Design a protein around this ligand. Sequence first.
Ligand SMILES: Cc1ncc(C[n+]2csc(CCOP(=O)(O)OP(=O)(O)O)c2C)c(N)n1
Ligand SMILES: Cc1ncc(C[n+]2csc(CCOP(=O)(O)OP(=O)(O)O)c2C)c(N)n1
Ligand SMILES: [Mg+2]
Ligand SMILES: [Mg+2]
Lengths: 666, 672
Amino acid sequence: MFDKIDQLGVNTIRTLSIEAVQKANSGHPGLPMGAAPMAYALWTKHLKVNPTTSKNWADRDRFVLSAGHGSAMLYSLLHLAGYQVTIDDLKQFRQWDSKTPGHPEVHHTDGVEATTGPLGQGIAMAVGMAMAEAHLAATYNKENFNVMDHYTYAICGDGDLMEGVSQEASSMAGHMKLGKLIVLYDSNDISLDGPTSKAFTENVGARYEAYGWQHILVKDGNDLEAISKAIEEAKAETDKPTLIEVKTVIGYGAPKEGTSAVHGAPLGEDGIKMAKEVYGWEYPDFTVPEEVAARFHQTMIEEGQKAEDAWNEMFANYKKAYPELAQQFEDAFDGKLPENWDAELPTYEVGSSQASRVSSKEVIQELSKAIPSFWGGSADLSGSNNTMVAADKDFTPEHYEGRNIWFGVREFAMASAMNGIQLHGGTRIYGGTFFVFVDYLRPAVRLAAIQHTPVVYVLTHDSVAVGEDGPTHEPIEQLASVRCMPGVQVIRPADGNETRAAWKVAMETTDAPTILVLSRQNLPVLPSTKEVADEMVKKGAYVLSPSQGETPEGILIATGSEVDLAVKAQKELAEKGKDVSVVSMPSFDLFEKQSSEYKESVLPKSVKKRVAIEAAASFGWERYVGTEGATITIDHFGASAPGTKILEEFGFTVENVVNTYNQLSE
Amino acid sequence: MFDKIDQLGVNTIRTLSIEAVQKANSGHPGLPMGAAPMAYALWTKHLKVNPTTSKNWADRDRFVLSAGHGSAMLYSLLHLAGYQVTIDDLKQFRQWDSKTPGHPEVHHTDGVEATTGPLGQGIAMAVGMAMAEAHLAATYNKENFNVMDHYTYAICGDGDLMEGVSQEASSMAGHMKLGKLIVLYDSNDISLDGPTSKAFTENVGARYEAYGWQHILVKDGNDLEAISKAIEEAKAETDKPTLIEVKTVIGYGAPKEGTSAVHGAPLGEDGIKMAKEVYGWEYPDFTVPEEVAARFHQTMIEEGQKAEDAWNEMFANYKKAYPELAQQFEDAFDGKLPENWDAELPTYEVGSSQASRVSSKEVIQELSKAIPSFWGGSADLSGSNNTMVAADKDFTPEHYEGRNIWFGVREFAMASAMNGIQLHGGTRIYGGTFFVFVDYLRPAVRLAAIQHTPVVYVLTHDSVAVGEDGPTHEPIEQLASVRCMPGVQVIRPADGNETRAAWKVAMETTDAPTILVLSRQNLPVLPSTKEVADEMVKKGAYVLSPSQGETPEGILIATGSEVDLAVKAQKELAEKGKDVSVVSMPSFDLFEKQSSEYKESVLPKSVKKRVAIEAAASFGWERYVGTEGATITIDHFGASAPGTKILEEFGFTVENVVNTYNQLSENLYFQG
Ligand SMILES: Cc1ncc(C[n+]2csc(CCOP(=O)(O)OP(=O)(O)O)c2C)c(N)n1
Ligand SMILES: Cc1ncc(C[n+]2csc(CCOP(=O)(O)OP(=O)(O)O)c2C)c(N)n1
Ligand SMILES: [Mg+2]
Ligand SMILES: [Mg+2]
C-alpha cells in the first residue's frame, strides 16, 4: 500500500514547491499543493523512467505537465526523482539563467519533456506522443520483442480543458483509440480569476466519454491509493484513452485553500507555516527527509535502472533477430536520414509549370519511400494540400504502421501533436493546412520555435491566386506574421526545383520548425533552379538571373510565384536598355544567417534601385528594398475572383513592375 | 404544414446553388443539396426576418451560415427571400466585384450577418450574438414590452464542430444557458478529404449534452416537417442551447452523393441533370418557379414587414413609457457615444508611475459609467488584465444585464463572440487576455479586420518585463504580427495619458478593430502627454520631446514602455551636446494614415540618424530607422527572471541607447 514515508514524500513536494515560490516572490503554489498526491503516486508507483539516463531512454513513459504553472511541483519531482535539479536550483526558481524557469522548458531543465506554459498544448503534445508510441510500436515491435511499450501521462487543469486545442486533441485521441494516454485532471474547481462555477460548468468526463475516452473520478485528491488504482484501470483500458479526474483542494493545507488566491501568488510565510501545521511538517526549509530520498531512490532510480537494463537486453536480442529494423529504430531516434534519401527526388525542366503543392507531393512521395521515419498528414486538406503518401496506409487504430495521418479539421491540435511527435523521437512529421489558417495553429508554431523542434509545416494556397474562395482564404499578412517570429524557418519555394530543395532544408533541419509556403497556382520553372537550387535555396536568397554587368543598375527581389514576373521584367527592361538582377529569396531567415559577403553578392549595397514583388504584405520589406526602394505588395485584403484576375488587378503584371522600377530610377 | 410547393422551394434552392457553382466552375454544391431542406424549413417557417429592411431591424432573428462553403445556398436563399441578390448576381458567383463571393462576406452582400469562411468562428459569432440579445433584452426589456425577443440560428457542418473555437464557444454557451441559440448541423458524414469515419468518430450530441445543450437528432434530412418540429422543440428549451443534428446525404440526387467529390467541386452538367431527375426538375436554368416565389413572398416578405411594424408600434409605446431607455436603445444601436463620455476620463501627472493595465482599468470603469452600451471581459485574466468594472455585475443567466463577462480560458471563442456581439449591435465590446496569446485568438482578429468590426482588444503583459513567467508568456514577434495585418489599429500606450487616448481612439473607431497593448510594469508619465496625448496619439506618431532647435541631429523613436528610456537618453545626449527628438509611435497604422507633411514633422527625411527602441521584434522598424539607422530590439525569445533584469541584459538601458546613437556617428555614412 502507501506508507507514512509516502505521505512525507507528497508533503516534501508540497513544501519544496511552496518554499520555492516564496523565495522567488513569484510563482503558482496552489496546484503543487493540490496535485502533489497524484504526482507522487504516478512517479513512485507507475511512471517508468530512468532518471540516471535522463531523456535518452526511448521507451521511457512520457509525462507532460500541461498545467505549466505547476512548474515548482515538477522541479520538486525531478529533484526527488534523481534528475539534475538541485535544492539550490530550486532556490533559484524564476531567476536569471536558472535551471528552474517559471514555466517548464524542454532542453533547459533535465527531465522536462515539453515546454508547457500555454494551456492545452501540453495535452495535445501528449496526444502526439501516444500517437508516436502506437506508430513506433506497430512499426518496430515483432513477436517476443516489445521494443515500444510505454504510456503517455499528462497532468492538466481546468484551463487546459477549456481550450479548443485540447478538445480537438481529445476527439482526435479518442478516434485514434490511444489507450496508453492517461491524463490526470487537477479538478481543483478553481481558476485564475475565481471558481470554475463562473465560466466552466460542463461535464468534462461526459465530453471525454463522447470523445471515446474512459473517465475515472477520484473524489479524494489526497487518497494516494485511489489514484494508483485509477491509473491501473486506465492501463487496463487498452482500447480507449483515459481521463482520471482528481478532485483536489487547490492550496491544500493553506489558509486560503479552495480560492483563486493560491493560484498564482506566493502563499506567504503565514500560509507555509499553517500548511505545514496541517502536514505536521516541522522539517527545515528546502530539506528532504532521508526516508523520502531513499523511497524515491528505490521507487525510481533503482527500479528505473532495472527496467532500462531489461529493455536494453531485449533490444540486444531484437537486433540479432531483426538487424535491419533495429538499426532503423536506432537511426530514426538519432535523427539520421537514410543514405541516398535525396537520390530519387524529383527534378524539373524549364518547359514545366507545376504548382508548388503538386511539386511538394512528389518530393513527399520519394521522401516517404526513402525515409521510413517520415510520416504526416493534413487538417482535412490532403487533396488540396497534396500531402498524401500513396503506396502507404492510413494511420488507424487497426494499422498504426500507417504513415498518413487524418488529423481532421483540428489544425492547432495537429500542430501541437506534431510538436509532441517530434519531441517523442523516432519520427519526422509533416502537417498540412492552408497558409491562411496558420493563424489557427500559430501558438503551436511559437512553441515549436521555443522548443527547437524540427517540425515541417506543409502550408499551401499561399496568395490571392486561390481566388474564388476570397479574402478569408487568401493569405496577405501571413508571410510577415511568421517572419517576425524568432526560431522559425519560413521558405516560399518559387518553382518545383526550389520546392524539392526547401524540403531538403527541412529534412536537414534539426533545431527549428520549418514552414513551407506552397502555391495552388501552377508555377513555371525558372532559369537556373534545376541546376543551382539544391545548393542555393539554403542560402535564403540567390541571384536567379544575373545582370549582364558585374554590378546591376537595379535589382528585383521576389519570392515564390512572383519570381516569374521578375525574370520577364528583366527582359522587358533590357529592351528599353535597363539591366537588372533578379534575386529569388525563398527564405528571409536562411539569408540572414549567411555571411556579409554572401549577402553582398545577392544584394550589393551600391544598388539602391531595389523593387520587390511579393503577393503579400509590405511589412519588413524595407530591410532589403530600403527606404528609397519600391515594392509591389498587397497591403489590403483579398477578393473573390479568378486568381489570375486578382493578381492582374493588384499590380502583379510585368508592365507594372517595369513602371515602378522606372519611376524609382527617376 | 408542408406541401409540394415547399419541396419545390427546397429543390429551387439546390438548383440555383449548383447551377451557380457550375457557371463559376468553382464552389461547393454538396452541402447546398443536402442542407437546402433544413435551410428552407428554418427560413420559411421559423426565421423572423424582414428582407425589405435588410439588416436594419434590431429585433430580427440572426442567421449565420457557419459553413461558408455553402455560400450559394445562402445567396439562393437571399434572392428567394426578397433580399437584394439578383439572379444576375448568382450568375456572377465567385467572379470579380460580384455581390456573390465564394464565401459569405458581411456588408458586401445584403442580409449576410457574418463573414464565415473559416470554420468554427461562425458558431462562436452566433454564441456572442445570443449573448448580445440576452444582455440587451435584460438591459432594455420592461414589463409588457418585448423590445428584444429574437433567436439566433446557425448552420454548421462537421468541420465547424471539429474546430476548437466551436468547442470553446459551445461550452461557454451552455454555461451561459443561451437557450435562444439554436445550431443546425449538417451531419452529412463527409469532409473535404473523405468520410468522417477517418477523423471524426465522436458523439457530437453527447459532448453537447455534457456542455449543457439539448440534442435533437433528425434522422431524415429531407423531412421538412421533422426539421421544423425540432426547431420548435429547441425554442421550447429556453434554459439550454440546442444542437439540431439533421442527418443529410451530401449532394442528394447527384451521382457522386455521399462522397467527398460533391463537397468542393462543381458536379458537372451531367451531375446537375441527374440530380434534377431525382428532383423532378424540368425547369430552365436559373429559374424560380412562380409557385415558389409567391410561397417565399407570403412566408417572409409579408409576415416579416408585419412583424417589424408590430415591433415598431410596441417600441413607440415603449418610447413613451420609458423614453430614457428607448433613446439609449436607439443610440446604442446607432453607435452614438453619450455626450460627455470623455469628460470624466482619467488624467495623469508627470510625478506618477502606473502600469497601462491599471490606467486602462481606470479608463474602462469611467467609460462603463458614461457609456451604458460598454461591456466586455477577459479569458480568466481579469486580475492580471485589470478589465473588471467594480460597479457592474457579472453577465450570468441570473443577471444578463451584467456587463462583466467571464469568457473563461477561451480566447478564440471570446474574440469570435466579440465579433458577433459587435455585428449584432447595441453594445461595445472589449476582450482581454495576455498579448502573447493573441496567437490563440488570431483568426478572429483577422475576421474582425475583414468585417470592419470595432471590437476592442485589451491585450496586456506586453514585453519581457513579464519576467518570471518566461519566454512562453513574454511577447516578442506579436506586435509586428498584427501591425503587418491589414485593417487593424494597434496602439502601444507609453503612459497613462496615452492609454486614455488609445481607448478614445478605439471608442471613436467605427470601421476597424483596435488592439491595445498594455504593460504589467509601471510606466512613468512622460513630459508632454497630459497636454498633447488626446490630440496626437490619434496621429500615430508624434514628437513627445522636441529637439533644442528646429532640425534635430537625431530621432530617438520609441513605443510604449521604452519611450521613457528615450527621454532619459535625450537628456544624457543633450548633456553631451547631442540634440535628438523623442518621437513616440503608439500606432504604425495611425501614423501612416496621416499626411505626407505631418510625417515629415514627426520624421524629417533630412535626419537619417535614427535609433528605435522597442522591446519587441525588429520587423518593420527599418521603415522608420532607415537602412543606416539602428534598432534596440529583441529578435529572440525571452527568459524567466525578474523583468527589470531581462530588460537590462537585453539592452533596454539608458547607456545602450546613448551608445547605439554614438556608434551611428562612427559610420562612414554620417561622416560628411
Ligand atoms: C493560453 C493561455 N491563456 C492564459 C494563460 C494564463 N493562465 C495560466 S493558468 C490560468 C488559469 C487556469 O486555471 P487552472 O488550470 O484550473 O489553474 P489552477 O487553479 O490549477 O492553478 C490562466 C488563465 C495561459 N497560461 N495560457
Ligand atoms: C478553419 C478552416 N480550416 C479548413 C478549411 C478548409 N475546409 C473548408 S470545408 C472543409 C471540410 C469540412 O467538411 P464539412 O464542414 O463537414 O463539409 P460538408 O460535407 O458539409 O460540405 C475544409 C477542411 C476552412 N475553410 N476553414
Ligand atoms: Mg484548476
Ligand atoms: Mg459535413
